[PDB]
């Protein structure tokens, strides 16, 4: 009812259980005024949103109907790596049931996508992604209960011959960006707000595109990062979301009107093909062209809600027991990507840590591109980048590093088992930039 807005179908837990059979299948669909066959979960692009509460049981059977093997990564979920198994392979025509319990303190926006090494980037680019939302008791406070809530899945695409465009040699180096810059699988949808306060859950599920988000005439009020709430709302004029990151923001519409949500120009250090003359400068690709993501129409006579004064206190973490250094490097022309000078080997354990301890990880980008570093299974707290303090306290699982930046991360080691860390420009992961962590 009311005005329509494209948004994935939601599947909710019931009586403490979300049991769902999800097929990964090629699917002809309508897209930006044409028809294309994508790879999809549940026949939709994006895939369906799974919405759960803490302590729920999730029983997701993944039915592989693809021509190639696949698996799922439960991105951001602090569960067992024996469930969130980055080494599992589900052959074509086979199924696998993922069963886990949602942790008691968890809240926010998470997502699921393929993690079969070597094939992540084509599979994710072809459409295999969906969101997972964990509801919180905090969502009941009046300042959030009465906000108009929406999920915005930021994911671009390019098509050739009615199918996802093939990966080029340049895509393996830079990561693939598409010419169709979509929101919830739609080209520049219009959202006609019925409330003056919106709560937008934001997911960057793109292979490589960055989104320097800005809303015309409006600040954003950040209330959640990748893996949970901030301690209190943080007003920002704009918000950069790297591949794999999520955020939740409140928007306070003060005036009537139509306002563009844009992805402003951002230069992530992608490299262009080489050229003659024009002098001026060199041959980086330079900043992205600005893109309109959606149109937001304010309701009549808008009166926004007050902001909540407080959200969730961040747990104090114990003193760390060990410091690690992880150096990211690249060989751009070979399109190979390294951590501490090595490419991923699934039979090599790179770091051995202890369950129930906290470590400090120093992640150093010695490349020229932005690399967004992701660690499975163990959410972390970012302390500093470039020697300066991170602007808020919240659980993160992806941290963006620009050329030369060093992040210092507090990593509490939770579940035992073997898991991975990798750049979330997924082409770089496929081309080497991944290593193996074992917790005992």
Is residue 431 part of the contact set for Cu ion (CB under 5 A)? no
Q: What share of the chain is helix, strand, coil (3-state, %, to 5)?
A: 5, 45, 50
Is residue 124 part of the contact set for Cu ion (CB under 5 A)? no
CB of 185 to Cu ion, least distance (A): 18
CB 394 within 8 A of CB 229: yes
Residues 390-409 that bind Cu ion (CB under 5 A): none
Q: What is the DSSP letter of 307?
A: P
Give the range of 45-53, 151-159, 275-283, 428-436 binding Cu ion by CB under 5 A.
428-436
Distinct helix (H) and strand (E) counts, the chain: 4, 34
Tokens matching residue 210: 């960055």
Is residue 244 part of the contact set for Cu ion (CB under 5 A)? yes
The smaller minimum CB distance to Cu ion, of residues 221 and 338, is found at 338
Is residue 117 part of the contact set for Cu ion (CB under 5 A)? no
Q: Quick one: 291 exposed, middle or buried, by C-beta within 10 A (0-12, 13-18, 19+)? A: middle
What are φ and ψ of residue 362, in 5° steps? -100, 110
376 annotated as ligand-binding: yes
CB 311 within 8 A of CB 141: no
Give the range of 57-65, 264-272, 317-325, 422-430 binding Cu ion by CB under 5 A.
422-430
CB of 164 to Cu ion, least distance (A): 18
CB of 24 to Cu ion, least distance (A): 16
CB of 129 to Cu ion, least distance (A): 9
CB of 86 to Cu ion, least distance (A): 10
281 annotated as ligand-binding: yes
CB 36 within 8 A of CB 28: yes
CB 65 within 8 A of CB 192: no
Angle among Cα 196, 201, 155 to the nearest 5 degrees reads 120
CB of 296 to Cu ion, least distance (A): 27
Give the range of 157-165, 188-196, 241-249, 376-384 binding Cu ion by CB under 5 A.
241-249
Sign of CA dihedral 31, 35, 41, 42: positive
Q: Name which position in 131, 154, 182, 425 contacts Cu ion (CB under 5 A).
A: 425
Largest CA distance in the chain: 67
What are φ and ψ of residue 412, in 5° steps? -75, 125
CB of 74 to Cu ion, least distance (A): 9
The smaller minimum CB distance to Cu ion, of residues 127 and 244, is found at 244
Q: Name which position in 128, 423, 436, 437 contacts Cu ion (CB under 5 A).
A: 423
Mapped onto helix, strand or coil, the DSSP state of residue 39 is strand
Q: Name which position in 117, 252, 371, 422 contacts Cu ion (CB under 5 A).
A: 371
The smaller minimum CB distance to Cu ion, of residues 73 and 199, is found at 73
- In the shown chain, the binding pattern of residues 41 to 80 toward Cu ion, with x for contact by CB under 5 A and - for none, equals ----------------------------------x-----
Residues present in the chain in total: 440
117 annotated as ligand-binding: no
- In the shown chain, the binding pattern of residues 329 to 368 toward Cu ion, with x for contact by CB under 5 A and - for none, equals ----------------------------------------
Element spanning 428, H or E: helix 426-430
The smaller minimum CB distance to Cu ion, of residues 243 and 353, is found at 243
Q: Which residue has the tokens 């999920």?
A: 151
Give buried/exposed letters for 5-17 (b at 16+ CB in 10 A, else e): bbbbeebebeeee
Omega before 299 within 30 of 0, i.e. cis: no
422 annotated as ligand-binding: yes
Q: Rounded CA gap, 426 and 204, in Å?
A: 13
Annotated binding site: 73, 75, 113, 115, 281, 371, 374, 376, 422-424, 428
Interface residue list for Cu ion (CB under 5 A): 75, 244, 371, 423, 425, 428
Annotated binding site for Cu(2+): 73, 75, 113, 115, 281, 371, 374, 376, 422-424, 428
């Amino acid at each position: 009812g009311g005005p329509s807005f494209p948004e994935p179908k939601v599947v909710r837990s019931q009586g403490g259980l979300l049991s769902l059979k999800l097929s990964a299948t090629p699917t002809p669909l309508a897209i930006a005024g044409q028809r294309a066959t994508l790879l999809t979960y549940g026949g939709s692009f994006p895939g369906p949103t799974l919405r759960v509460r803490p302590r729920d049981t999730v029983r997701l059977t993944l039915e592989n109907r693809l021509p190639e093997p696949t698996n799922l990564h439960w991105h951001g979920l602090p569960i067992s790596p024996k469930v969130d198994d980055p080494f599992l392979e589900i052959p074509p025509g086979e199924s696998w049931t993922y069963e886990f319990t949602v942790p008691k303190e968890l809240a926010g926006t998470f997502w699921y996508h393929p993690h079969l090494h070597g094939r992540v980037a084509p599979q994710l680019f072809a459409g295999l992604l969906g969101a997972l939302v964990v509801e919180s008791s905090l969502d009941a406070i009046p300042e959030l209960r009465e906000a108009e809530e929406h999920l915005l899945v930021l994911k671009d695409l390019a098509l050739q011959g009615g199918r996802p465009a093939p990966h080029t040699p340049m895509d393996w180096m830079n990561g693939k960006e598409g010419d169709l810059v979509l929101v919830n699988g739609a080209l520049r949808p219009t959202l006609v707000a019925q409330k003056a306060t919106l709560r937008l859950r934001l997911l960057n599920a793109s292979n490589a595109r960055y989104y320097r988000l800005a809303l015309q005439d409006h600040p954003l009020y950040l209330i959640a990062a990748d893996g949970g709430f901030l301690e209190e709302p943080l007003e920002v004029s704009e918000l950069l979301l790297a591949p794999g990151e999520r955020a939740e923001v409140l928007v306070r519409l003060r005036k009537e009107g139509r306002f563009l949500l844009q992805a402003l120009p951002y230069d992530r250090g992608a490299m262009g093909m080489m050229d003659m003359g024009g002098m001026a400068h060199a041959m980086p690709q330079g900043p992205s062209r600005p893109e309109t993501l959606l149109y937001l129409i304010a309701p009549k006579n808008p009166k926004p809600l007050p902001l909540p004064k407080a959200l969730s206190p961040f747990p104090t973490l114990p003193a760390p027991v060990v410091t690690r250094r992880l150096v990211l490097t690249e060989d751009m022309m070979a399109a190979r990507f390294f951590i501490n000078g090595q490419v991923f080997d699934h039979r090599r354990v790179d770091l051995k840590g202890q369950a129930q301890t906290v470590e400090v990880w120093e992640v150093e980008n010695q490349g020229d591109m932005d690399h967004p570093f992701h660690l499975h299974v163990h959410p972390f707290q970012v302390l500093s980048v470039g020697g300066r303090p991170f602007p808020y306290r919240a659980w993160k699982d992806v941290v963006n590093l620009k050329a030369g930046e060093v992040a210092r991360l507090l990593v509490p080691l939770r579940e035992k088992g073997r898991t991975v860390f990798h750049c979330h420009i997924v082409e770089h992961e496929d081309r080497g930039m991944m290593g193996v962590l074992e917790v005992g």
